[PDB]
Enzyme design. Structure first.
Site, PDB file in Angstrom:
ATOM      1  N   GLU A   9       0.799  -1.224   0.000  1.00 56.14           N
ATOM      2  CA  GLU A   9       0.000   0.000   0.000  1.00 56.14           C
ATOM      3  C   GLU A   9       0.845   1.295   0.000  1.00 56.14           C
ATOM      4  O   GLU A   9       0.516   2.249  -0.706  1.00 56.14           O
ATOM      5  CB  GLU A   9      -0.956   0.010   1.199  1.00 56.14           C
ATOM      6  CG  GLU A   9      -2.027  -1.095   1.196  1.00 56.14           C
ATOM      7  CD  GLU A   9      -3.115  -0.916   0.139  1.00 56.14           C
ATOM      8  OE1 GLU A   9      -2.970  -0.058  -0.747  1.00 56.14           O
ATOM      9  OE2 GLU A   9      -4.128  -1.648   0.197  1.00 56.14           O
TER      10      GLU A   9
HETATM   11  C1  LIG Z   1      -8.655  -0.384   3.218  1.00 56.08           C
HETATM   12  C2  LIG Z   1      -9.759   0.318   2.419  1.00 56.08           C
HETATM   13  O1  LIG Z   1     -10.173   1.410   2.768  1.00 56.08           O
HETATM   14  N1  LIG Z   1     -10.278  -0.355   1.255  1.00 56.08           N
HETATM   15  C3  LIG Z   1     -11.169   0.162   0.548  1.00 56.08           C
HETATM   16  C4  LIG Z   1     -10.670   0.040  -0.981  1.00 56.08           C
HETATM   17  O2  LIG Z   1      -9.750   1.012  -1.111  1.00 56.08           O
HETATM   18  C5  LIG Z   1      -8.564   0.584  -1.945  1.00 56.08           C
HETATM   19  C6  LIG Z   1      -8.468   1.356  -3.002  1.00 56.08           C
HETATM   20  C7  LIG Z   1      -6.882   1.292  -3.436  1.00 56.08           C
HETATM   21  C8  LIG Z   1      -6.339   2.475  -4.249  1.00 56.08           C
HETATM   22  O3  LIG Z   1      -6.587   3.611  -3.917  1.00 56.08           O
HETATM   23  N2  LIG Z   1      -5.507   2.192  -5.393  1.00 56.08           N
HETATM   24  C9  LIG Z   1      -4.923   3.254  -6.183  1.00 56.08           C
HETATM   25  C10 LIG Z   1      -5.848   3.722  -7.310  1.00 56.08           C
HETATM   26  S1  LIG Z   1      -4.979   5.052  -8.142  1.00 56.08           S
HETATM   27  O4  LIG Z   1      -3.563   4.622  -8.463  1.00 56.08           O
HETATM   28  O5  LIG Z   1      -4.984   6.298  -7.279  1.00 56.08           O
HETATM   29  O6  LIG Z   1      -5.714   5.520  -9.379  1.00 56.08           O
HETATM   30  N3  LIG Z   1      -6.223   1.170  -2.271  1.00 56.08           N
HETATM   31  C11 LIG Z   1      -7.280   0.853  -1.168  1.00 56.08           C
HETATM   32  C12 LIG Z   1      -6.865  -0.251  -0.375  1.00 56.08           C
HETATM   33  O7  LIG Z   1      -6.310  -1.289  -1.166  1.00 56.08           O
HETATM   34  O8  LIG Z   1     -11.707   0.227  -2.016  1.00 56.08           O
HETATM   35  C13 LIG Z   1     -12.712  -0.625  -1.754  1.00 56.08           C
HETATM   36  C14 LIG Z   1     -13.745  -0.619  -3.121  1.00 56.08           C
HETATM   37  O9  LIG Z   1     -14.535   0.559  -3.119  1.00 56.08           O
HETATM   38  C15 LIG Z   1     -13.461  -0.524  -0.556  1.00 56.08           C
HETATM   39  O10 LIG Z   1     -14.509  -1.575  -0.518  1.00 56.08           O
HETATM   40  S2  LIG Z   1     -15.950  -1.148  -0.295  1.00 56.08           S
HETATM   41  O11 LIG Z   1     -16.069  -0.288   0.937  1.00 56.08           O
HETATM   42  O12 LIG Z   1     -16.785  -2.359   0.060  1.00 56.08           O
HETATM   43  O13 LIG Z   1     -16.427  -0.418  -1.524  1.00 56.08           O
HETATM   44  C16 LIG Z   1     -12.522  -0.715   0.591  1.00 56.08           C
HETATM   45  O14 LIG Z   1     -13.145  -0.376   1.792  1.00 56.08           O
HETATM   46  C1  LIG Z   2       2.339   1.002 -12.239  1.00 60.02           C
HETATM   47  C2  LIG Z   2       2.726   0.640 -10.803  1.00 60.02           C
HETATM   48  O1  LIG Z   2       3.527  -0.266 -10.573  1.00 60.02           O
HETATM   49  N1  LIG Z   2       2.131   1.368  -9.843  1.00 60.02           N
HETATM   50  C3  LIG Z   2       2.409   1.106  -8.420  1.00 60.02           C
HETATM   51  C4  LIG Z   2       1.223   1.439  -7.514  1.00 60.02           C
HETATM   52  O2  LIG Z   2       0.076   0.683  -7.942  1.00 60.02           O
HETATM   53  C5  LIG Z   2      -0.750   1.392  -8.888  1.00 60.02           C
HETATM   54  C6  LIG Z   2      -2.136   1.587  -8.292  1.00 60.02           C
HETATM   55  C7  LIG Z   2      -0.836   0.575 -10.168  1.00 60.02           C
HETATM   56  O3  LIG Z   2      -0.415  -0.615 -10.204  1.00 60.02           O
HETATM   57  O4  LIG Z   2      -1.335   1.085 -11.203  1.00 60.02           O
HETATM   58  C8  LIG Z   2       1.506   1.091  -6.035  1.00 60.02           C
HETATM   59  O5  LIG Z   2       0.544   1.892  -5.309  1.00 60.02           O
HETATM   60  C9  LIG Z   2      -0.390   1.161  -4.469  1.00 60.02           C
HETATM   61  O6  LIG Z   2      -1.134   0.142  -5.135  1.00 60.02           O
HETATM   62  C10 LIG Z   2      -2.057  -0.538  -4.272  1.00 60.02           C
HETATM   63  C11 LIG Z   2      -2.647  -1.680  -5.066  1.00 60.02           C
HETATM   64  O7  LIG Z   2      -1.637  -2.542  -5.571  1.00 60.02           O
HETATM   65  C12 LIG Z   2      -3.113   0.449  -3.793  1.00 60.02           C
HETATM   66  O8  LIG Z   2      -4.042  -0.212  -2.942  1.00 60.02           O
HETATM   67  C13 LIG Z   2      -2.454   1.610  -3.062  1.00 60.02           C
HETATM   68  O9  LIG Z   2      -3.457   2.568  -2.725  1.00 60.02           O
HETATM   69  C14 LIG Z   2      -1.354   2.242  -3.924  1.00 60.02           C
HETATM   70  N2  LIG Z   2      -0.614   3.230  -3.157  1.00 60.02           N
HETATM   71  C15 LIG Z   2      -0.182   4.388  -3.672  1.00 60.02           C
HETATM   72  C16 LIG Z   2       0.579   5.281  -2.736  1.00 60.02           C
HETATM   73  O10 LIG Z   2      -0.404   4.703  -4.837  1.00 60.02           O
HETATM   74  C17 LIG Z   2       2.926   1.546  -5.638  1.00 60.02           C
HETATM   75  C18 LIG Z   2       3.634   0.787  -4.501  1.00 60.02           C
HETATM   76  O11 LIG Z   2       3.047  -0.431  -4.021  1.00 60.02           O
HETATM   77  O12 LIG Z   2       3.915   1.367  -6.672  1.00 60.02           O
HETATM   78  C19 LIG Z   2       3.563   1.950  -7.931  1.00 60.02           C
HETATM   79  O13 LIG Z   2       4.713   1.929  -8.800  1.00 60.02           O
END
Ligand SMILES: CC(=O)N[C@H]1[C@H](O[C@H]2C[C@@H](C(=O)NCCS(=O)(=O)O)[NH2+][C@@H]2CO)O[C@H](CO)[C@@H](OS(=O)(=O)O)[C@@H]1O
Ligand SMILES: CC(=O)N[C@@H]1[C@@H](O[C@H](C)C(=O)O)[C@H](O[C@@H]2O[C@H](CO)[C@@H](O)[C@H](O)[C@H]2NC(C)=O)[C@@H](CO)O[C@H]1O
Ligand SMILES: [Cl-]
Ligand SMILES: [Cl-]
Ligand SMILES: [Cl-]
Ligand SMILES: [Mg+2]
Ligand SMILES: [Mg+2]
Ligand SMILES: [Mg+2]
EC number: 4.2.2.n1
Length: 429
Positions: A285
C-alpha cells in the site's frame, strides 16, 4: 531382496535429505515451505507414502548421509552434479537451470571477469560446485585465494558481502534472486560459467527402481507446470518485483520496517493474525510510509479510505499506529465476513482481494467464476475472473459493474510474495 522403491513402499515413508534454508526446506509456526520440500512432498504423494524430511548442515554431511547404511532415499537440495562421476552418488534428470554468479558489494569496484577474482576476500560453501569452480580457476591463477565454510547457508554468505565482511561470494542465480530482497548492497558482478541443471541425488549402485520413478515424476511435474509455479514462488522475486524493486525492498526492510514492526506485531497479536501478512499489506500500500497518498484521496500506511477509517474508528489516517490497527482490523473483519464455503488458505487471499476491491465487486467475480464452471471458492479460479470487471463487455451485465480488477490481481500477488519474503527472514550468526 527388496528394491529401493519396494523398501520405501513397504515402510510407507520416503526419507528425503535436504538443507535447512528458505530455498530448500524451512520451518515457521504456520508450517513447512521450500522449493525442494514442496516438490518432494508431491513425489511422496505420487508414491502414496509419507514424506519425512531430514537435514544436513553442509554438503559433505548431506552426501555422507545419503551414502550411509540406513540412510535416506534421496537428496533434494538444489544440488549441482559434480564434473566427474563418483560411484557413491547418482543424479536424476535435471529440473532447474541456474547460472553461477559472482556477487559483490555496491560501493566497491565490480569485478567483471575471472582474472579479477584474484586479490579478493572470497567465501563459498565447502563441498560445493562453486568451490570446485574456484579450485579450477586457481590452477590458472595461483594467486587466487578463497575461503570455504562448512557451517553456514547461502543467506549467510550473501549477508557477509552485504555488510562488508567479505568482498565476494559465488552462488546460484536462483539463490541470489531469493535473497536479493534481504541485502540492499549485494549485486551481481558477472555470470561465472555456463548454466547448469540441478538434480536430486540417490545412493550409488545399480538399483534404478526409485530413480526411474523420480525421473518420471520430474517429467510430469514439468508438464503440469509444477516446476514453474514453485520456481516462481521461491526464486521469482527479481522476475516479478524487478531487480531494483528487489534491492529497494531490502533497503526498506532494513530502514523502514523497524519503525513500525512493533505496531504490526501488536495488532497481529490482538487480532490473532500473522503480523507479517499485515506488514505485507502495508508494504504494497505505502512502501511503509505513513504519510503516503494515492491519486484518489486514500492515505496513510495501510491506505484507508475516509469511509474505512471512520468505520474502524481511525481518527488520524496519517498516524502509523492507527493506520496499521485500522487496516488490520478491517482486513480481519472482511475475512470473517467472507462466505463460509471459502476455506483457508484461499480465504486469506479472497480477503486481500476484498481489502482492495470491496466485497461487492468480489462477489461479482465469484459469480462469474461459477458461471464459467470454475470453483468460486478457489482463489486461483476467481483470480482469473477479476480482470474482466475492468472490461465493459463483461462488467456491464454484472450487479456492481466496473472495477479495477487487474489492479486487484496485482495487489494480491504482490502481498502474497512480500508475505513469503517476511516469513523467510532468518537471523544473522
Ligand atoms: C482499506 C480500504 O479502505 N479499502 C477500501 C478500498 O480502497 C482501496 C483502493 C486502493 C487504491 O486507492 N488504489 C490506487 C488507485 S490510483 O492509483 O490512485 O488511481 N487502495 C485501497 C486499499 O487497497 O476500495 C474498496 C472498493 O470501493 C473498498 O470496498 S468497499 O467499501 O466495500 O467499496 C474498501 O473499503
Ligand atoms: C504502475 C505501478 O507499478 N504502480 C504502483 C502502484 O500501484 C498502482 C495503483 C498501479 O499498479 O497502477 C503502487 O501503489 C499502491 O497500489 C495498491 C494496489 O496494488 C493500492 O491499494 C495503493 O493505494 C497504492 N498506493 C499508492 C501510494 O499509490 C505503488 C507501490 O506499491 O507502486 C507503484 O509503482
Ligand atoms: Cl536460501
Ligand atoms: Cl484494472
Ligand atoms: Cl495470487
Ligand atoms: Mg547450519
Ligand atoms: Mg545448490
Ligand atoms: Mg466500485
Amino acid at each position: 531382496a527388496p528394491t529401493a522403491l519396494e523398501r520405501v513402499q513397504k515402510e510407507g515413508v520416503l526419507r528425503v535429505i535436504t538443507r535447512n534454508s528458505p530455498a530448500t526446506y524451512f520451518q515457521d509456526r504456520n508450517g513447512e515451505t521450500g522449493f525442494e520440500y514442496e516438490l518432494a512432498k508431491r513425489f511422496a504423494e505420487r508414491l502414496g507414502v509419507e514424506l519425512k524430511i531430514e537435514t544436513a548442515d553442509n554438503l559433505d554431511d548431506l552426501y555422507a548421509q545419503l551414502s550411509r547404511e540406513g540412510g535416506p532415499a534421496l537428496a533434494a537440495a538444489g544440488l549441482t552434479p559434480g564434473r566427474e562421476d563418483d560411484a557413491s552418488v547418482r543424479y536424476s534428470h535435471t529440473y532447474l537451470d541456474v547460472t553461477p554468479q559472482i556477487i559483490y558489494r555496491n560501493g566497491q569496484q565490480r569485478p567483471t571477469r575471472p582474472e579479477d577474482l584474484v586479490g579478493k576476500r572470497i567465501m563459498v560453501l565447502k563441498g560445493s560446485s562453486h568451490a570446485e569452480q574456484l579450485a579450477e580457476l586457481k590452477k590458472q591463477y595461483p594467486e587466487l585465494k578463497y575461503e570455504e565454510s562448512d557451517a553456514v547457508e547461502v543467506v549467510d554468505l550473501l549477508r557477509m558481502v552485504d555488510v562488508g565482511d567479505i568482498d565476494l561470494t559465488l552462488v546460484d542465480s536462483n539463490e541470489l534472486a531469493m535473497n536479493q530482497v534481504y541485502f540492499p548492497n549485494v549485486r551481481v558482478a558477472f555470470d561465472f560459467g555456463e548454466a547448469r541443471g540441478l538434480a536430486w541425488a540417490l545412493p550409488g549402485g545399480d538399483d534404478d527402481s526409485l530413480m526411474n520413478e523420480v525421473n518420471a515424476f520430474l517429467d510430469q511435474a514439468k508438464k503440469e507446470g509444477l516446476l514453474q509455479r514453485l520456481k516462481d514462488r521461491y526464486y521469482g522475486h527479481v522476475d516479478v518485483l524487478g531487480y531494483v524493486g528487489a534491492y529497494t525492498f531490502a533497503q526498506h526492510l532494513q530502514q523502514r520496517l523497524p519503525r513500525y514492526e512493533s505496531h504490526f506485531k501488536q495488532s497481529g497479536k490482538q487480532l490473532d493474525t500473522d503480523w507479517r501478512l499485515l506488514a505485507a499489506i502495508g508494504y504494497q500500500e505505502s512502501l511503509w510510509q505513513p504519510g503516503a497518498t494515492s491519486k484518489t484521496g486514500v492515505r496513510g500506511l495501510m491506505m484507508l479510505t475516509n469511509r474505512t477509517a471512520q468505520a474502524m474508528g481511525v481518527s488520524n489516517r496519517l498516524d502509523p499506529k492507527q493506520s496499521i490497527q485500522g487496516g488490520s482490523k478491517y482486513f480481519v473483519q472482511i475475512r470473517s465476513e467472507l462466505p463460509e464455503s471459502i476455506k483457508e488458505p484461499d480465504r486469506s487471499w479472497f480477503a486481500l482481494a476484498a481489502y482492495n476491491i470491496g466485497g461487492a465487486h468480489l462477489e461479482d467475480a465469484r459469480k462469474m467464476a461459477e458461471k464459467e464452471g470454475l470453483n468460486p471458492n478457489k482463489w486461483l479460479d476467481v483470480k482469473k475472473m477479476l480482470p474482466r470487471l475492468a472490461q465493459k463487455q463483461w462488467y456491464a451485465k454484472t450487479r456492481y459493474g466496473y472495477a479495477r480488477g487487474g489492479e486487484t490481481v496485482h495487489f494480491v500477488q504482490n502481498v502474497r510474495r512480500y508475505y513469503d519474503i517476511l516469513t523467510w527472514v532468518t537471523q544473522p550468526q
